[PDB]
Amino acid sequence: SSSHPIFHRGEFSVCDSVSVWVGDKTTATDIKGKEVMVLGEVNINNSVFKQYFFETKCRDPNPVDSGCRGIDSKHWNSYCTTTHTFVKALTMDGKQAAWRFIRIDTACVCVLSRKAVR
Amino acid sequence: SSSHPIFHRGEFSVCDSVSVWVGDKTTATDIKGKEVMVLGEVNINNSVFKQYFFETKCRDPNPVDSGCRGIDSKHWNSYCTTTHTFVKALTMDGKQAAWRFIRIDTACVCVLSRKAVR
Numbered sequence: 001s002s003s004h005p006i007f008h009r010g011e012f013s014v015c016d017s018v019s020v021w022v023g024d025k026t027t028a029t030d031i032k033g034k035e036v037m038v039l040g041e042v043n044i045n046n047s048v049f050k051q052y053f054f055e056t057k058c059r060d061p062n063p064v065d066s067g068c069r070g071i072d073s074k075h076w077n078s079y080c081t082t083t084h085t086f087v088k089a090l091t092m093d094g095k096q097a098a099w100r101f102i103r104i105d106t107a108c109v110c111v112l113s114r115k116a117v118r
Numbered sequence: 119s120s121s122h123p124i125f126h127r128g129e130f131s132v133c134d135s136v137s138v139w140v141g142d143k144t145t146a147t148d149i150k151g152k153e154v155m156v157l158g159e160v161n162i163n164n165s166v167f168k169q170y171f172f173e174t175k176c177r178d179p180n181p182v183d184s185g186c187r188g189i190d191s192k193h194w195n196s197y198c199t200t201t202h203t204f205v206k207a208l209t210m211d212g213k214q215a216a217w218r219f220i221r222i223d224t225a226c227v228c229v230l231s232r233k234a235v236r
Binding site for chain 1: 122123124125127128129130131132162163167169170172186187188189190194195197199201203204205206217219224225227229230231232233234235236
């Protein structure tokens with residue numbers, strides 16, 4: 001059996017967002033949780049390469065307009081949370097230089113957050 | 119005004135998934151759509167570094183069990199789609215070596231896919 005629908009056929013959108021490629025990511029939060037100096041460009045011998053980092057701005061879900069079709073924005077909180085991933089950056093934080101994991105936001109997805117605090 | 123709820127206070131989970139760190143990503147689909155030879159390890163002069171890539175397996179949403187609370191699995195298709203990001207890999211596909219964007223799945227999020235094809 002090959003499920004082409006609910007995989008490729010259908011729809012995979014609810015909340016939209018925009019990711020811009022920045023080479024000026026001078027600092028970023030690493031895996032450990034430390035905001036390390038990423039600089040923006042990696043120095044390979046005598047050649048520097050500005051790495052395209054993703055700055056993702058969440059946008060107000062246009063395919064559903066109000067909130068998120070399905071999620072009750074009264075009982076729950078239809079919110080587009082920013083999904084961030086761990087990319088590799090040549091940072092000079094300690095010793096000389098190391099390729100560490102830094103957290104960059106790469107998408108915004110709608111999730112039903114729970115009402116508890118006003 | 120500082121919205122701590124619907125941002126930090128609340129809940130941000132609906133579909134769970136697991137990302138494993140692999141250093142044996144020998145090939146991956148680049149930004150252009152070509153499955154390039156990533157090898158798995160980057161060669162920096164005389165030092166090779168196996169880059170931790172993310173292989174994310176989608177899991178059956180346990181916080182909601184059946185499908186996705188809010189999404190009607192009869193009218194719509196509650197499906198956890200795998201969100202993939204563009205990481206940088208030193209590939210030897212052309213000339214000598216270049217740091218290209220390759221697509222790796224980093225998360226799985228539930229979206230109401232549309233019924234159309236069976």
